[PDB]
Write a protein that binds this DNA or RNA. Sequence first.
DNA 1: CGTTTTATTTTTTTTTTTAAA
Lengths: 272, 601
Amino acid sequence: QLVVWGTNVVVSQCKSKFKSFIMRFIDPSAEQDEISENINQPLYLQKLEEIHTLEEPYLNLNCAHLKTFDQDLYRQLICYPQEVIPGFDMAINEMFFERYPAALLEHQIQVFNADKTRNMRSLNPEDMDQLISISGMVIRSSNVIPEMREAFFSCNICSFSTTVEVDRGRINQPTLCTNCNTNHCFRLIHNRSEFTDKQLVKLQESPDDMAAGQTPHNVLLYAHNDLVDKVQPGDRVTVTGIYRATPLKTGGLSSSVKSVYKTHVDVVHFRK
Amino acid sequence: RRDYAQDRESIKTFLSEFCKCDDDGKKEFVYGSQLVKLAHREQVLITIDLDDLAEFNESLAEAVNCRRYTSIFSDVIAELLPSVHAKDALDVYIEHRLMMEFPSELMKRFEVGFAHSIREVKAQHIGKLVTVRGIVTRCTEVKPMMVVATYTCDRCGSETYQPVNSLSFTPVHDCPSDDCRVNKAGGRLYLQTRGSKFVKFQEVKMQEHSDQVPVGHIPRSMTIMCRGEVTRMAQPGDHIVVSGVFLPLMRTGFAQMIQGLLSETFLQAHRIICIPEELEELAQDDFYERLATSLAPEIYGHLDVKKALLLLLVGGVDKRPDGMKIRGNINICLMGDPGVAKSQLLGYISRLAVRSQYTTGRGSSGVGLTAAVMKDPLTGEMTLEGGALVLADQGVCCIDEFDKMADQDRTAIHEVMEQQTISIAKAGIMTTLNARVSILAAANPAFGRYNPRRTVEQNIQLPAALLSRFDLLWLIQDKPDRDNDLRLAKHITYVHSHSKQPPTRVKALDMNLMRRYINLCKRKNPTIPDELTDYIVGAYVELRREARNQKDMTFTSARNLLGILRLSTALARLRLSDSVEKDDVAEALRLLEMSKDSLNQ
DNA sequence: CGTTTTATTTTTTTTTTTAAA
Ligand SMILES: Nc1ncnc2c1ncn2[C@@H]1O[C@H](COP(=O)(O)OP(=O)(O)OP(=O)(O)O)[C@@H](O)[C@H]1O
């Protein structure tokens, strides 16, 4: 029982439950459920063969297999999903050693693909931080906009050339940087640091279930640093993602803020 | 002046002593039922009406401000728990905050809500909850609206409460916290969405009825802001009536553009009312033809046209083979200039046919009836903003004198002949729009009134491409008949000396009863037994021979056979027996034959 | 224990659109 004050979620439960699930794994479709189907080993171990032997990083993987296992994992993954997903990556980054301990364990994975939607036309306060996946047809082909992550400092006397990355937005100031004798005042410069890429293009929903005499209503979201021009733009495609929200700068005279919040979706994956 | 407290006693008496035995069936607890529905965690909104408190007393018939009463009753029953753990997101999330351990609005969990127009809306109406009907305009969409966030101090730990009523705001800074008070131990301030409370939020403009606006007047609109549960509760162009409040709008900001006491008002919502149950009475009546007898009484005779329409009213033919759909909508064409009162039946249908429309011979060029584009360097970009033909899905958009609009105008409408497909490479798309509208064509003959020498397409000037898209083409001419116009005359004059035409030949059917009986029809999906398939394909050939035996005659499309198929199964929807049979198509062919063989003799 | 806050209008070239014997 070790948890955020306002939640009910923990790393170890989901980690162990999923590591047992992938040990409860021979391709549970093609070896437990669809026994009439067959590729008989945990596919992720098989992939750690067929990924490492392939040497072909950035896996793609769903989690709809998990319906058989304990559904509490499903739920607390549905609802608290930027704080359990790295734990399932940690389990994979442990699985590395099940099949190759002394590998070049320096690369990471990419990654869901299981839950439903009906349409974008009408959603709710409940549906705020939850898993969604919807589809349509693409409109645009954007450019890239990067994003910073750290400050690289300078100095005046004796080269107090300090450095430090960001939580998300602050660096502290005592009289010097990481207060080292304060031979001079605080320093900062913003380039020799960590940056991060993205874009933005929107989608037009285009099902056969489009309500009567209704217009296009359309959605949009950025990317992450590998999910960037996967895309010959403009075709029938699905996304997964996490409904996101953001407050808005009222007016623009000063720091007033809006009542109304704009929304878009977190940036994960696509489908063909 | 009045006490806002002793009324709390009054309402405690009201709701507590609430099993009001006016009828067999009220000794049970009514708002106790709703109470336990709160205890069901189900109802998040209760309701007030004039009758409810009207019996109670007569003050508050003019006391209820509509504002203080609401927060008072809300807090009143919030502290009322006469009555299970994981029911809500936030509700259990507080328990998560209490696992180691508020205003009752931050645990909102429920709500309550409770013969004049904007023109009459005299400017002493502030605060009063009043009634007006209009028309919706400029359909928009809904987003979340904060009320009070939880700006935790982290180092201190004190989920700050910023309960807000405004529409604009300002952040909360580092810490108004007890340990973050003069006691030097402090962090910074930062919200937690999960524990935060927000609310749905729909807005759209409201335009005037257009039946009141005097000779020297121009309709104007107001704004609608309906938040919370009632979102998504009206579409564009619904004639709707709203009871709510007029409330001004403290547009704070600049100190010289405001500062006039500007008062750009707006409205607060409660409801969107828009002006089987019948089954026992539907058991009382079992007839097919009486619809024509009580639908559109205003003219005697010419039933055949009407029954042809009522079929389109009927519907019920569709299939999705091969992955592809099939057009299950009937589209009549109409030529003639007698006095028919196409305008009559058009108004009649457009009134009774819910989700109706109307356009005229030049009022909508090709971009207006469909989507279109615009221009302005003051609001942003432009969109499609589809037209009547765009909007009229699940219904009919009725053009009058399509012959006279324009020849190229036949194009885009012809595009919608293949239904639900409105292609637009105009706003950088090949967009669809789902043109799912039944289509009504009515026009007049060419120069003359069906000059018998100038033959079809000799007297007419219409490309075959559109006639092929039309199931039925109908010329209406009635030459001098000594006896004909008599009956029609006295018939007309009946509602001139009187107000209701048809006496003592049928039971008239009101718009409600008509629509409801039609409402029971279309979901049969009836049976067409297999002998028809061999039989009907034979009967169709009977046409194709007497089409070819004269060489100056009409061409034929596959839709001729597809149509004669398409009509019959529909009418079984109003037979309500799932039994497409011989009569089901014998009337189909019968009416097809009556569509023709009428101008030579 | 004091002394200070805040506004923009007309013309281009494209893609839309529209006119007379
Ligand atoms: N038999 C009839 N039943 C009902 N109304 C009739 C009848 N005969 C004449 N009338 C009245 O005469 C009027 C004739 O003008 P009307 O509105 O019919 O023009 P229209 O026939 O629609 O013109 P067009 O056919 O050229 O468009 C109608 O409004 C109709 O109410």
